Amino acid sequence: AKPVPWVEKYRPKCVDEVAFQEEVVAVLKKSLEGADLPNLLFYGPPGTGKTSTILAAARELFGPELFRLRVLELNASDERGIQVVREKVKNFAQLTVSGSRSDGKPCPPFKIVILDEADSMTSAAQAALRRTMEKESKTTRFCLICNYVSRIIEPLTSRCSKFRFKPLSDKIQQQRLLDIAKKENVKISDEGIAYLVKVSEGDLRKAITFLQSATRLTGGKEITEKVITDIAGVIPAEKIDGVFAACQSGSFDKLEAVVKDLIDEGHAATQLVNQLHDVVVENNLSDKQKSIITEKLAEVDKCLADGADEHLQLISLCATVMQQLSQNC
Amino acid sequence: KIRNLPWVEKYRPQTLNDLISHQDILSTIQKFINEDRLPHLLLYGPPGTGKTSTILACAKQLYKDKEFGSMVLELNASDDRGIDIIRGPILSFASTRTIFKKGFKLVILDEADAMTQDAQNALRRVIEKFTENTRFCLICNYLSKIIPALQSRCTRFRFGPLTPELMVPRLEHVVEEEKVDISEDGMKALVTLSSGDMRRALNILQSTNMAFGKVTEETVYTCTGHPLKSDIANILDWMLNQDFTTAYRNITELKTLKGLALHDILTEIHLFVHRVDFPSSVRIHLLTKMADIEYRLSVGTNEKIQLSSLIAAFQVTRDLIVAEA
Amino acid sequence: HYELPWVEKYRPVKLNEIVGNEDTVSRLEVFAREGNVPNIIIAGPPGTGKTTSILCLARALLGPALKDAMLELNASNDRGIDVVRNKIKMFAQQKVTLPKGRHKIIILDEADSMTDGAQQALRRTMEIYSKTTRFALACNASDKIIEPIQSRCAVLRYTKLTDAQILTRLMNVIEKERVPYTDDGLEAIIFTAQGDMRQALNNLQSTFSGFGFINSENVFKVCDEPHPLLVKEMIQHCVNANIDEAYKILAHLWHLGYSPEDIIGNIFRVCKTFQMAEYLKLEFIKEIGYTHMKIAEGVNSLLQMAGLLARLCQKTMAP
Amino acid sequence: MFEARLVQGSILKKVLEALKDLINEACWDISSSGVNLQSMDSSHVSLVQLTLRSEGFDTYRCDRNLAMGVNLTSMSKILKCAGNEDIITLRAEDNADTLALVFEAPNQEKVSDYEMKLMDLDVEQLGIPEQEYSCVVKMPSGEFARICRDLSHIGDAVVISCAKDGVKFSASGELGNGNIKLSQTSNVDKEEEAVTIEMNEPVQLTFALRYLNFFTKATPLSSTVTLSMSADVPLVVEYKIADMGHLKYYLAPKIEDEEGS
Amino acid sequence: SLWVDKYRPCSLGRLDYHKEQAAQLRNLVQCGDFPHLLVYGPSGAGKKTRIMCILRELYGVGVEKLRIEHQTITTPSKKKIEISTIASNYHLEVNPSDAGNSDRVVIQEMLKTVAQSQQLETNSQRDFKVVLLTEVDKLTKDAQHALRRTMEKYMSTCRLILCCNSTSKVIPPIRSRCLAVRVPAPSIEDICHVLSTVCKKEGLNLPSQLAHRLAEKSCRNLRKALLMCEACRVQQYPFTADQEIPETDWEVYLRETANAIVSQQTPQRLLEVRGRLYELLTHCIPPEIIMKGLLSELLHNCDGQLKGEVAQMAAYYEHRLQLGSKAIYHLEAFVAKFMALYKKFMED
Amino acid sequence: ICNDQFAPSLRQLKQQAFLLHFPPTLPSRLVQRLQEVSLRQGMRADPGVLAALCEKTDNDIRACINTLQFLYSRGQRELSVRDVQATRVGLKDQRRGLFSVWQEVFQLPRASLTSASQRFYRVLHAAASAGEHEKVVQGLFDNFLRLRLRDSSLGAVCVALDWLAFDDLLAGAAHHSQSFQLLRYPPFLPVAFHVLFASSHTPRITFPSSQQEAQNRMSQ
DNA sequence: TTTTTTTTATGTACTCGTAGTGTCTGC
DNA sequence: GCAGACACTACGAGTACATA
Ligand SMILES: Nc1ncnc2c1ncn2[C@@H]1O[C@H](COP(=O)(O)OP(=O)(O)OP(O)(O)=S)[C@@H](O)[C@H]1O
Ligand SMILES: Nc1ncnc2c1ncn2[C@@H]1O[C@H](COP(=O)(O)OP(=O)(O)OP(O)(O)=S)[C@@H](O)[C@H]1O
Ligand SMILES: Nc1ncnc2c1ncn2[C@@H]1O[C@H](COP(=O)(O)OP(=O)(O)OP(O)(O)=S)[C@@H](O)[C@H]1O
Ligand SMILES: Nc1ncnc2c1ncn2[C@@H]1O[C@H](COP(=O)(O)OP(=O)(O)O)[C@@H](O)[C@H]1O
Ligand SMILES: [Mg+2]
Ligand SMILES: [Mg+2]
Ligand SMILES: [Mg+2]
């Protein structure tokens, strides 16, 4: 009787529990009946349910006893070089399809190779998969899972049927979160669940983690908006107004002061970029100033995605918006 | 009999008459085969155009099923093709006679761009020395990764992209052999989204038929997730006709409503940016900004900021285009 | 019996049948007639006739003693460090009875594939046994062969064949094969050959087998126009900051099925030897490399190539 | 249900060590007549045809015909830890993938069950012509192995000729030529060491030495080997096992071009 | 033992600041089903203290008995690499960045063997083990891509507490899988209270002005504030209000380097500044901190209409330094660009 | 006997051996010897065309004799200027030293050959044929700030450092993505310096040591 | 008129040193 | 019959480079 975190306790065991990804779920439910399952390429943002969907499909297709004989799951936590593709994957694809389900349910006549996190594979190891996928297609199937489809080569893009996992909408995510909170005997207000589905941004894993952590923090009592704002790392609007007032002042000393105060408070630069972007696109600035400022915001977000320093990028963005705000003064 | 196969492998052109597009190249190869004048071939082109299918149909036409394992040596990127293989099994296959029936042998080297330059340099005198005994077919997607010495020895055929006028009857044959209800706009959307590729047109057809049961324009654009032409025209009209806030709200509502991705929006807006009679200074700025936005989407970057920058690249040039007059 | 293709069927067996590089081929004819040939390294483009010249010279020098007084090695052989010591040196030490002015010939075809250690070991066995044996090396990239080996041999360099030199051999093949033709068809074959006799014979045989007549459209239905002939025009359009014609050529190359790597390789190849300002050429090359890093990292679309063209046109207007 | 039973483990070890560097994968064709294996090498130059009889096993049952394609490195590692005097059971179900090798330890106390996963290669049947040959030679296998080892030191491609006199081996190499000719060696006390010529028309064909040296590794299987040669059909090396079956090796001639001069 | 380690709190109830976060962290880890944690904040805020307090709250007092364990890992290039590990009977502490670019081999081989195995004793130890990945912001993206399926598959028997300074260097697949815990730096009042309590426990008297100057000079770093307070106690026992506070040599060397930059704008001065930057990179100073110190000292000498351009150039060359591998090229390019801008501003 | 004294395996020999370094042979003695060889073989040649061969083969006796043996044969007796001046017979690729490449980059040739495109291609081919690309990059990095630079606004220094960062980014991307077809552009790093810092002065080029000393000190 | 050293992350190719091991000699 | 000596191939280890 050990406790388990809610991201794994509420993982979809079957394909009916996967939310909002209606096209790929419908394809896999047709393949459960006996339709010809093609090669799959799942791609999309994190937390949308790419791994859970194919694991639920494999569990529905093969059952418990045939998962070790029909599914080869390789991810980036193990070595996937050119020799792993040439030896291990090809010898798995060349195996016979034997073993039947003992519970009387039908079993498909193919194997499944789940090459999860196919971004990290090299171009040579991806090029070695091509005739393995084409030649052994009678007895095995392939499911490449990635976050960026540009890092997978165009022959493997052509060989697989591409499914893009959209970010979950607020209706489906709110319904799933309310079902999880109902099954866990915890109460969450409407403002709390609205701020939760605003914060999580289509990441259902982040939403389940925030809901579990808010349940553990409050002890099982009512979850308000304040605990969601506390645990979500959302910068208060007073800091954003102070940053914009420092930019409207036109003095770089106050700009350095507010940047150092935001850095010393440990706020993430991505959250600051998101909140500054919302303030910039939702005010009465001119179109040219908004244009330049949003272009600098996109460049700063790209630089932070490449592991640049937070303080220098934030002071460059703040200098740009200070120049734009003091140009019209 | 019925088999559980993907439609890109269930429906493969086993003969040269089942391929659609490259009629002059296939006629020349058929006349090479019928006159027994088959040279070393170099098939190059974009993926999904039917090069491996062409050489497999030629190998099945040349050799019978009782002797196919001794006359054809097919090696690809899943096999080890180092210089010890060129000096080993390939040279011994090229330099020896046949076992069962007298004839010329065939060494198919699929994905020849994946071979190392040492192997490609070792292949030159193997190709030239045993021209009478064996024939070589190099197939690649990128011709630059094949050395010019091997490009000189093999006559090259460009298997270019499949035109959508010739892609339609093969798709109609696949549809009539699978009992699929498809409309004219569904076939048009299939041959538009394929873009000279019959793998992606079969995959999309099978995925749409499994997801929805019918193949129309809306079902194809919903299963693929690609935006429609009207959505791209609306996005361009909003980015060129109104201010930043209203265009941002309308494009954000359109993306949240239909679940669109910014990569496909960027591709279709790039296609629209050349049809619109922009000034040449405006077009350079728009292409540079859109290329930068496409490059920023390849990493862990928030897509909302990149959507705002995509709007910003046109809101910069609105007053420039208007005051140009 | 199976009929050979016209590249291997119409390989020249005499040195007088080799067209192109008339001075070097004439001196090789004189050396084959008289003897006492020095060590020779022939460098040049592919399909020029370096292997044909080496084999014809060796055959005309030896005659009946070709099987016992010649050692031919290729990149298909081992020719490592244990072969230069134990096979080439043993053949140079081997006694072969030959007439005067004739020596044993060690043909080392495609000498770029040899390692640096093998070429270092080759030096003294070439220098010592030169009274009895001679060396005839053929290569494409002359920089791969080291400086002592090039000093120990006469470095003959072959240039690309002219259109008249290709046309003479093609007319010989046509009169041997009774191929009907027109002048624009042979002009198209010369255009698609690009200084390569192998490609000229292959394109002629492909057109004759597929259509049976040589005109321009029958050639271009199977052959293809060269890539740099349009890449030079699009680079010239990028120099004059004309983005529309440059994108027209880029879209024409994109719809023909060329990958972004091949297109950017031809763009770099044209920009390396283009006739423009040097600082502008360096800026062009740096922008090509910056785009090619994105092409190699995974993002490779028509938008990226159009952005590269826009950046090349922006480099002109920004001094 | 397929269940064969090798009375001793040495013969299977010799068979799988003969084909280890040659055969890519083993295709055991199972019938009521016995166990058949027709497999080419990785270079598609050689061919191996092993035929083991049902009477040679301890117990042999076969309800339906099977065709079990399996990897050879795994079976080599399984048969490496097998005794030479123990009974080895091969088991296979009707619609399963586990080919089971059951044997005993060299201490002869504990049992060992090693499963193998069957491969799913669709291999077209190679038609053996089974025609008459223009040269048939019965010679000892040890002398053939010795003469192949002695010609491997001289060259790499060997010209073997046969006529009314007898077999003849030539190796035109870098050191020089080595020409070894044997005939009528039946006048000894032994019966295995004898050279007998049966057919008429002389043939001269050139073969690789690596494949001949791989073929000679089956020397402990048979005391007397048979060489079959003709102008069109390939080189056949026939080993006749005592009470189990036979083994055929097929090797194609090389392409040799005469001098123009 | 220094003052940074003598008076470190042991439990979550003994923290001087962020007491509400201490109560929330005690409520979070009580049930045992808490997810992976990503403790992020500025250096010296108290992240490692709160992680060790979380470990005490989970297990017994046996988490303070630590030991060095050495592991040898074989790379795909077959190069044996030695990695140290702080370990206890309940948890492990690994810093994979000591393997550098081979850090992925730590994640694929060393970590998964920890994750794939259950525990020996399940009574003294709890139902799960804890792995502390220290400084995950210095991990390569290959290692962070190797981390995610290990974090997702075995999270019921191995919980992980990643610690970093900036979450921008952590990939969004890793940040999606863990709860982000923000530990801000203590304010001036909190650092003054901590220094006053430390001086009272040592039996000393500390003025409020000296503690305020220590908290101002430490830039909200409590470790450096405690070290500066102990150094001020050592160098002069009577605590004067205007006592001279000792300073680090690399910071004053950076100040002198930027003074040498702003003093003259010539290629000879650029070659001297490049020598100073090699001297700084020689002593294992990270290049982003060199860039930050150069910007913070050069902005004191610029005019009001140049600071934005100088900060934008500093951020641009910092990003190009992160994209590359040789820091001296981008550092000297930033110094040369600033010299050109400064010469243009002063002559016009 | 060796051809490169600065090999890493011979340095411990250089501290113990009687180091005799060969200068290139004098053109007058070489021209006289080739004239004597041609007179012995019965061939006529003016000393001008023999000096042209000498400057073509970079004072190589064996290459000049082999070139004369091929060019004479027996068809003609008098050697012509255009036969030696042609690139078809006798031209060989020499391996340039590092200091010769740095002298070609940082110094203009003294006064056809006055066009900038010929100097561009000559510097590019010399830096390509020299080899040891990283040593050339380190020498350019350690020697370009010691010149008497006319660019007082430091624009040339900034674009040179941009080119160096371009080289570093290309090396990182080629060693990261395993795409080595990006290694055609860093050969244009030396020639770029030839467009930036070409002077008619006589610069003192020192061997690069800063990036190795800093690496050793960082490791210690 | 001027010279030392190991990082980049795989994949391949070359070269060289070492160690079980089958076979031959001898009392 | 069994200990010593011979060459034999398989395997471990170090190094370089990858472009036009
Ligand atoms: N569509 C969904 N329906 C139901 N639960 C979901 C869904 N998406 C995510 N979840 C929950 O969030 C957890 C994470 O889902 P995953 O399938 O691992 O996400 P993911 O697609 O793998 O993200 P990446 O790209 O691998 S970081 C699951 O275990 C579920 O508990
Ligand atoms: N011309 C064509 N006619 C019919 N089907 C085609 C054609 N081209 C492609 N296909 C389909 O695509 C499948 C695979 O085509 P391939 O032979 O792999 O094409 P390819 O151009 O050689 O691909 P690459 O370049 O190797 S990824 C075939 O089995 C068909 O289902
Ligand atoms: N100058 C020529 N005259 C006549 N036929 C030629 C000539 N050059 C090439 N050929 C033809 O092209 C074939 C190939 O010639 P090769 O000598 O093999 O080319 P190559 O010069 O060796 O180029 P590489 O570097 O080896 S690919 C010959 O067999 C001829 O049929
Ligand atoms: N609540 C507290 N009370 C007193 N001292 C503290 C407290 N929190 C942290 N410290 C001290 O401040 C320093 C912070 O260092 P550390 O805990 O390692 O955090 P970080 O990892 O962010 O540097 C430690 O040396 C610790 O002794
Ligand atoms: Mg996943
Ligand atoms: Mg293919
Ligand atoms: Mg050749």
Coordinates of N, CA and C in Angstrom, one line a residue, chain D residues 197-247:
Chain D
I197 N 38.6 -41.5 -59.6 CA 38.1 -40.7 -60.6 C 37.0 -41.5 -61.4
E198 N 35.8 -40.9 -61.5 CA 34.7 -41.6 -62.1 C 34.3 -41.1 -63.4
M199 N 34.4 -39.8 -63.7 CA 33.8 -39.2 -64.9 C 35.0 -38.7 -65.9
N200 N 34.5 -38.2 -67.0 CA 35.4 -38.2 -68.2 C 36.0 -36.8 -68.5
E201 N 35.1 -35.8 -68.8 CA 35.5 -34.6 -69.5 C 36.3 -33.7 -68.6
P202 N 37.5 -33.2 -69.0 CA 38.3 -32.4 -68.1 C 37.7 -31.0 -67.9
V203 N 37.8 -30.4 -66.7 CA 37.3 -29.1 -66.4 C 38.4 -28.3 -65.7
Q204 N 38.5 -27.0 -65.9 CA 39.4 -26.1 -65.2 C 38.6 -24.9 -64.8
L205 N 38.5 -24.7 -63.4 CA 37.7 -23.6 -62.9 C 38.5 -23.0 -61.8
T206 N 38.3 -21.6 -61.6 CA 39.0 -20.8 -60.6 C 38.0 -20.5 -59.5
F207 N 38.4 -20.7 -58.3 CA 37.6 -20.4 -57.1 C 38.4 -19.6 -56.0
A208 N 37.6 -19.0 -55.1 CA 38.3 -18.3 -54.0 C 38.7 -19.3 -53.0
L209 N 39.8 -19.0 -52.3 CA 40.4 -19.9 -51.3 C 39.7 -19.8 -49.9
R210 N 39.1 -18.6 -49.6 CA 38.5 -18.4 -48.3 C 37.2 -19.3 -48.2
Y211 N 36.5 -19.5 -49.3 CA 35.3 -20.3 -49.2 C 35.7 -21.8 -49.2
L212 N 36.7 -22.2 -49.9 CA 37.2 -23.5 -49.9 C 37.7 -23.9 -48.5
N213 N 38.5 -23.0 -47.8 CA 38.9 -23.2 -46.5 C 37.8 -23.2 -45.5
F214 N 36.7 -22.5 -45.7 CA 35.5 -22.6 -44.9 C 34.8 -23.9 -45.1
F215 N 34.9 -24.5 -46.3 CA 34.2 -25.7 -46.6 C 35.0 -26.9 -46.1
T216 N 36.3 -26.8 -45.9 CA 37.1 -27.8 -45.4 C 37.0 -28.0 -43.9
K217 N 36.3 -27.1 -43.2 CA 36.1 -27.2 -41.7 C 35.2 -28.4 -41.3
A218 N 34.5 -29.0 -42.2 CA 33.7 -30.2 -41.9 C 34.5 -31.5 -42.1
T219 N 35.8 -31.4 -41.9 CA 36.7 -32.6 -42.0 C 36.4 -33.7 -40.9
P220 N 36.1 -33.4 -39.6 CA 35.7 -34.6 -38.8 C 34.4 -35.2 -39.0
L221 N 33.5 -34.5 -39.9 CA 32.2 -35.1 -40.2 C 32.3 -36.3 -41.0
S222 N 33.2 -36.3 -42.0 CA 33.3 -37.4 -43.0 C 34.8 -37.7 -43.2
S223 N 35.1 -39.0 -43.3 CA 36.5 -39.4 -43.6 C 36.8 -39.2 -45.1
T224 N 35.8 -39.4 -45.9 CA 35.9 -39.3 -47.4 C 35.0 -38.2 -47.9
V225 N 35.5 -37.3 -48.7 CA 34.8 -36.2 -49.3 C 34.7 -36.5 -50.8
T226 N 33.7 -35.9 -51.4 CA 33.4 -36.0 -52.9 C 33.4 -34.6 -53.5
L227 N 34.1 -34.5 -54.6 CA 34.2 -33.2 -55.4 C 33.5 -33.5 -56.7
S228 N 32.5 -32.6 -57.0 CA 31.8 -32.7 -58.3 C 32.0 -31.3 -59.0
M229 N 32.4 -31.4 -60.3 CA 32.7 -30.3 -61.1 C 32.2 -30.5 -62.5
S230 N 31.8 -29.4 -63.2 CA 31.4 -29.4 -64.6 C 31.6 -28.0 -65.1
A231 N 31.4 -27.9 -66.4 CA 31.6 -26.6 -67.1 C 30.6 -25.6 -66.8
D232 N 29.4 -25.9 -66.4 CA 28.3 -25.0 -66.1 C 27.9 -25.0 -64.6
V233 N 27.7 -26.2 -64.1 CA 27.2 -26.3 -62.7 C 28.4 -26.0 -61.8
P234 N 28.1 -25.5 -60.5 CA 29.2 -25.1 -59.7 C 30.0 -26.2 -59.1
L235 N 31.0 -25.9 -58.2 CA 31.8 -26.9 -57.4 C 31.0 -27.4 -56.2
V236 N 30.9 -28.7 -56.2 CA 30.1 -29.4 -55.1 C 31.1 -30.2 -54.2
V237 N 31.0 -29.9 -52.9 CA 31.8 -30.6 -51.9 C 30.8 -31.4 -51.1
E238 N 30.9 -32.7 -51.1 CA 29.9 -33.6 -50.5 C 30.6 -34.3 -49.4
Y239 N 30.1 -34.1 -48.2 CA 30.5 -34.9 -47.0 C 29.3 -35.9 -46.6
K240 N 29.7 -37.1 -46.6 CA 28.7 -38.2 -46.2 C 28.9 -38.6 -44.8
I241 N 28.0 -38.1 -43.9 CA 28.1 -38.5 -42.5 C 27.7 -40.0 -42.4
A242 N 28.1 -40.7 -41.3 CA 28.1 -42.1 -41.3 C 26.7 -42.7 -41.2
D243 N 25.9 -42.1 -40.2 CA 24.5 -42.6 -40.0 C 23.6 -41.5 -39.7
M244 N 23.8 -40.3 -40.2 CA 23.0 -39.2 -39.9 C 22.4 -38.5 -41.2
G245 N 23.3 -38.3 -42.2 CA 22.9 -37.6 -43.4 C 24.1 -37.2 -44.3
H246 N 23.9 -36.1 -44.9 CA 25.0 -35.6 -45.8 C 25.0 -34.0 -45.9
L247 N 26.1 -33.5 -46.4 CA 26.3 -32.0 -46.4 C 26.9 -31.7 -47.8

